[PDB]
Structures are given as structure tokens and as C-alpha cells.
């Protein structure tokens, strides 16, 4: 899962950049919120460890 997360976020960022350059404002607006959510998710590490997005020790928690 860790190896597979960066491609998703970066490819969505590519989508956002493309729609910016093409001047397609509506789609860019629809896509910015997910961009910021992914940014927050990747750069917060709510887990106290703060070394991996998914941590085997923190994983297996029901919440």
C-alpha cells in the first residue's frame, strides 16, 4: 500500500496541472478539493509514529 500511494496522488496532481494549463476551470475546481485532501493525508501522518502513512503496528486497529 505504501509503495502504491504516491502514484495515485501525483497522477491526480498531473490531472489538475493539465486542466490548469488547458484553462478548463470547472474540472480544476472539482478536482482541487481531492488534491488538497491527498496533500493533507500524505503530509500530516496523524499516526504518532510519523514515519509511514500506513504502519504495520498502527495498522490492524479497527478505527
Amino acid at each position: 500500500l505504501r509503495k502504491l500511494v504516491v502514484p495515485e496522488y501525483s497522477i491526480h496532481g498531473l490531472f489538475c496541472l493539465m486542466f490548469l494549463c488547458a484553462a478548463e476551470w470547472v474540472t480544476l475546481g472539482l478536482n482541487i478539493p481531492l488534491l488538497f485532501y491527498h496533500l493533507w493525508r500524505y503530509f500530516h501522518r496523524p499516526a504518532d509514529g510519523s514515519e509511514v502513512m500506513y504502519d504495520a503496528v498502527s495498522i490492524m486497529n479497527a478505527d
Binding site: 498531473l14 493539465m18 494549463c21 488547458a22
Partner: protein, 51 residues
């Protein structure tokens, strides 16, 4: 015409626009992109990214 009498016009004309003849424009920096439209260049960039 109120004080003299004219003939039918021997030459009809009207207002027109005079400009300086377009010259060979001094080549612009980045004139090497002119053979292809900007949209082609951007599609090239993003096709490179996608490939």
C-alpha cells in the same frame, strides 16, 4: 450646388485607409516554434508526460 451647377461625377471616390507596407518582420526570439501552433507544443508536452 445651391450657388453653382455641377456635372455628373467624372470620378467617384471615398474615404480609405493608408498604412505603411508590411515589411519582413525582424525575427523574434522563439520564432523556432512558429512552424507548429502553441496547442501542438502543449499537447506534445503532456503526451510526453502521459507516455
Amino acid at each position: 450646388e445651391e450657388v453653382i451647377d455641377f456635372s455628373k461625377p467624372f470620378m467617384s471616390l471615398g474615404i480609405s485607409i493608408m498604412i505603411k507596407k508590411p515589411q519582413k518582420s525582424k525575427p523574434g526570439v522563439f520564432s523556432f516554434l512558429d512552424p507548429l501552433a502553441y496547442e501542438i507544443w502543449m499537447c506534445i508536452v503532456f503526451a510526453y508526460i502521459g507516455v
